[PDB]
Amino acid sequence: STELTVQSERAFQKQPHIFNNPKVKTSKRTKRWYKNAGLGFKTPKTAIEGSYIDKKCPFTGLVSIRGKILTGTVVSTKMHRTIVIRRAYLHYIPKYNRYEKRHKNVPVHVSPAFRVQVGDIVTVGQCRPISKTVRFNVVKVSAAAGKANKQFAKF
Amino acid sequence: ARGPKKHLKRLAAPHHWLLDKLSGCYAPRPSAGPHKLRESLPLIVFLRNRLKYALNGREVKAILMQRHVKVDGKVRTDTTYPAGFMDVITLDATNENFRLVYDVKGRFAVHRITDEEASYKLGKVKKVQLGKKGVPYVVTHDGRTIRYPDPNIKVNDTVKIDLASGKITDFIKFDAGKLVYVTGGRNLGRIGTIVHKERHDGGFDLVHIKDSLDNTFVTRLNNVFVIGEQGKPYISLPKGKGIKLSIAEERDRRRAQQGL
Amino acid sequence: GISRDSRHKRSATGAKRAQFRKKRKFELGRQPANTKIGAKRIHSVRTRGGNKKYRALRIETGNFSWASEGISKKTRIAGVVYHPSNNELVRTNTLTKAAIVQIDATPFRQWFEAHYGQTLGKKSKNAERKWAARAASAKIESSVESQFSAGRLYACISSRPGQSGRCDGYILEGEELAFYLRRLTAKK
Amino acid sequence: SKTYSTPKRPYESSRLDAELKLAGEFGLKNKKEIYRISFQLSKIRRAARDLLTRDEKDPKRLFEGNALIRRLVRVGVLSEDKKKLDYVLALKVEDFLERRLQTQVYKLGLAKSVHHARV
RNA sequence: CUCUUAAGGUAGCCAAAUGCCUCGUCAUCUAAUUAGUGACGCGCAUGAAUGGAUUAACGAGAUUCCCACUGUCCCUAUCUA
RNA sequence: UCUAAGGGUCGGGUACGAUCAACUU
RNA sequence: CCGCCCGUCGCUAGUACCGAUUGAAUGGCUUAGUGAGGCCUCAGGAUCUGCUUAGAGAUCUCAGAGCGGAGAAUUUGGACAAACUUGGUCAUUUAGAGGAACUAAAAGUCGUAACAAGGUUUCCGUAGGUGAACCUGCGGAAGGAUCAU
């Protein structure tokens, strides 16, 4: 996905200080850097095999996940490499000894190692600030569909 | 704001100095030093308030400006010098070597020790790094850098320091079956022989401890400090041995202990 | 001055925030200088903690790395157009990080000739021993070997001259070099 | 770091009768003194109420109840025959006033009146 | 209460292009206003398809004020054909 | 004095190239 | 029941509303214009000064000339931007001929609408009309004066 083909931008997109010498005829032609983000988050094969760059990625980029780990439902996918998740919770009012539903919306950066869709549940981790509003990054996905595509096929 | 605070008011000072609050005014702010502001004890407090050798700050200064008192083999004529845990204070008057340790209620127990025991102190290694030119160093809880130690000294172990040469004589690892002296927390001043450890990656490693009375409890590993093996401490322990006799036992004692 | 702060912006909801603090030197921003070519002129600015920064104006030389061979050489640098950055703070046809520049190529030519015994474009026992030993490597690339004819090499600046005061960089080689000249349409 | 409080209905002749009887019996100049003893007694009573709501063989109950009982015994309000944390609730202003010194002077002799004792 | 009419001027409107007395009275607009506007109304002689009251838009229609602008004027002088 | 954007006709061994010409912003 | 009670009108006092006056005052925010100051930058170079062959018996000049170094006034451009002016906008107070309500007083005037079948049963909605209460029409209710052939 992401159809940057790899180099959609006017600058050359590369991993910094990752040098593929044209002299040495290595039989891979594929030098990448990835890391284990940690905390038992699995580094995807899309990240290891892919061609994207995404400096804000927690696997191939320079950010680091540290602090909190949260979960939420994707309620928007209309930006580029970032989403908005809904974080629903119940707030207690003691006067009434009861609860009330509350939500906070939380913008999140998503690598192109993840195919994220509205409705999917997604686990995110605290990163350094990478935009005005974004402080979190997608680190795991759980699609709540089962690939239920043929259920629409009815005849 | 606009730079660091130089003052400290009575009521803001840690509760384990025991002075007085309501417009009693100011308290002694520990100067920057090896120990933290709250987990420390200045000499003015150690001398005016605990030992009663002095009555006033000018008396304490008159003491300190005579090379009488030294912390860790060094004089420290500063009034608000932050002395801390496992620090050795040496007065040639009475030849009294004072170790600062914790009683069970969390105050600073005034432990008197022998000169042979004052020869050394102990230190919990906080980090182990390589310095410049590939020289490994360990940092203790008292801000002491020690170069080229044994390579088996990993983090949270404790170390025996000779206090005249800042060198390492022997180290004790962090493992089960090792004594512990809790520093910091609700359970401050307790001594309880590590049962086991709870990892929690990214999440404040916890430690499960068991007193001699089989009173199990739990603390944070940043607050744990090892001191020896089962029943063989490396320091003279204070009166109480870190047991925390409950209030009921305490009244039973001080009613049946003594009619005075 | 220039507040490098967010309390002035707006809320993410679109809410207009109130002016809440007089500006703070914590939140400080400063004015660039348009690092041009020619006649080295470096002004030092005092920063937080002392910590001199070296604001370069009008550099002429730079230190450029040839990494397939693993060396670095000083050269003089050449034309520029940048940036696609600014309108407010920097002004005029500058030189900056990530900029593509032409450099002298003569120290690299000399080094290559003395290190491989081989020319580009178009003796003693020790030298012959060395050249024969480290031969089978002077085969770089059509593009770089063609640049050496003109005697001007495409390189990228990797240093930030308005922070450090230098024009260090690396010579373009490979997929970068294949990529780059379809771009550089900019002033300011 | 300060304390005291007073009653609710400013009249109610039965209270006035009782209060003035206590004042005449024990040599008092004010209703504030009876109010003070009632205040102390109220603090005691509500403490013991909370402890009795707690479980038996509960450590806070044992500790604070034995302490309160010990204090009242050594003052002599609570007789040493009744030491069970229910006569603490059954106590009364007469039982405190009887342990006041003025009253103790008179009852021990030595003054031939409570007013002479106060003087 | 009384006389009287075919009916006795209704809703509404007004010193209005309709009000004599009249430069009506009160307010506003001005330093000052027979002007203007708003209100008042036993209205010489207002008034309902001889249409009444109102009305956005339109007007080489009549009219008042404000800003800008000016030889209209203070106060005239000069140039060109 | 420059920059950018906005098009036509031909080519696909069953992602893009060659060539041509307007004015508008 | 010689009980209770409605409204108009009129006198008095008070409260708020409408209202010509493109009303007035105050304050906040702001477009546009002008724009101090310092900061960065392009220049500038009074002045001082090291060295050097130079003008001059053997930590020194006597015409002068180059290599420089520090460097004030002044000055270009830029960002930061006070303040002022002009408009606009919002809010809050406030005047105002006259108009229209409310409340309260007061042994006021005209009637007597409701409470008994209140002397036309009352009330609701709507519409019209009348000095005032009110009346009338249409449909509805009984909180009816009928729980009933």
Next chain:
RNA sequence: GACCCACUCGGCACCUUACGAGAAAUCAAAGUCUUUGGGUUCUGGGGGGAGUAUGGUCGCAAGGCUGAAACUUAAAGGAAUU
């Protein structure tokens, strides 16, 4: 098919009583509520001013929906009793 008897589901209601409920009038719900909690929506907080003024909105209009304050007042009101 219509009637009669018995039963049944679902409806409009009715007669009797209070084990209860209620201020009472009365209520098989207005009960199962100080032995206070089956689920859920709407509305009221003394009487007047006032469902007025103002602003919005709907409407051709008539008007509807929404909806104050100042000010005033110790009673207004509900069932029953003689």
Next chain:
RNA sequence: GGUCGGAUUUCCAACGGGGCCUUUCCUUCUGGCUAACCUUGAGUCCUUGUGGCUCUUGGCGAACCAGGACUUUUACUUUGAAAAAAUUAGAGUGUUCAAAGCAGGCGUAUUGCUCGAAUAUAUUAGCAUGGAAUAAUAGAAUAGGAC
């Protein structure tokens, strides 16, 4: 009450935990200690009914931790840590009582001894932990399902 109003063993019972077996996996993979062990080597100063102090070399993985694998998600509740100090409640104590304060008490007071300055609460959010009812959620139906 066997010592002189305090305690003890087997006790008739109750209340709460843990483990195992009943079709019941109540997570495993690479390992140590292999341990609580077929390890039994001659075995015992005991009311033979086990109230029970005692050894000779060689078994099953959590009782010790190293890593791993995958590990449905929550809410709820217990425990703990977190919970600034003063204040609040509250223990002790001669401020001459009390409000207060954190002091002070004991000797042969002829050159000293010593108790202390507790403790609790502090809703919500977050952290760890045991439970697993109640209430949601997922878990193999055009089998891409499990071992």
Next chain:
RNA sequence: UAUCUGGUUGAUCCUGCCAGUAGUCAUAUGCUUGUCUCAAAGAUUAAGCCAUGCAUGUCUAAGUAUAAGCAAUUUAUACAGUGAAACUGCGAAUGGCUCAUUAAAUCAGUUAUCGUUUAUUUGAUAGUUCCUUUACUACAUGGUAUAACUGUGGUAAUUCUAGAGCUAAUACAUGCUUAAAAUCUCGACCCUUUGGAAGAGAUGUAUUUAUUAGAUAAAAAAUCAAUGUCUUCGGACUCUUUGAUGAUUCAUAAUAACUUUUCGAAUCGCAUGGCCUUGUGCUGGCGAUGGUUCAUUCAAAUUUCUGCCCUAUCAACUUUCGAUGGUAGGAUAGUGGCCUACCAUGGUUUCAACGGGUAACGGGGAAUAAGGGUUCGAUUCCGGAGAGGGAGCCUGAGAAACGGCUACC
């Protein structure tokens, strides 16, 4: 100490308010006032602000003292006692005061910096620098100014100052003196096929860039470019160097160079000793101050999650000349639309957005309550702000400082 009473009526039961009642570290005021202890106090109205009059600087044995100042050391002819001034260095950014603005913003608790600065403390930590590196030199330690001071003056006046003459420094500016060994390159030379060589230069630390190493769960064999330490040159081949984190492009090290070139004591006080080749010879103690980097400490700046009053007679806001994100750059101590270039069109909202109001600083906490709760919180702790309003900035580790400058009002 979980309490109620008077008032609608001819009387009754209700609804329902009014009134009473108690408290208030809640204020004011009135009357009265003998004592002891404890004691708040120009917050409310004018963040008008006190509009008067007074105050934060500082020295030791140990930076610089020819005071034309004192006394006198009587241990001294260079000082060497004390010590005004002034230079230097630290500090004045703390404290104290107030609550104007402020409604996810402060703030509370809870996180994080693998996203940065940090004077001072505390502990560690510079044989590498004579740049023609055999005269080039002072390394028994080199240069210049200037204050205070002397004296001439200006102005009505201010913590105004000019001109002239001296002189100092852990001021300013410069600047050498301490290894040995190894590894690298260059390489005269002699030469080989196995090729080996004498000389020259570089290798501290800091800055900038590029590159590299920074490993790793386990077992037997063929081939080769060169065999490689050593060889039975059959190939025995083992030996092997690699730290930490949950996680890194981490720490660290090594290559190539780069810098207008940082740091690597021209400093100070007491004690005066040890060894001889007895020279004012060589060695040597206890400290002070200063200094690079690392770590620690005091901090600071940003930051995660949740949480705040009243209003719908505020329902649609944001993006205009940044609103949301992306790429790149600039700036910053650092992250980041912080700022802009290009690009895309997003982001918040009936789970109350945005707007308005607050007689709104936030909390810890206070008052009153059976329990639940309502109200208050200008304050004696904590942290945010502000110094008449605005804005800007110097110095410094730290200020957008006001008992510091600049301007406008």
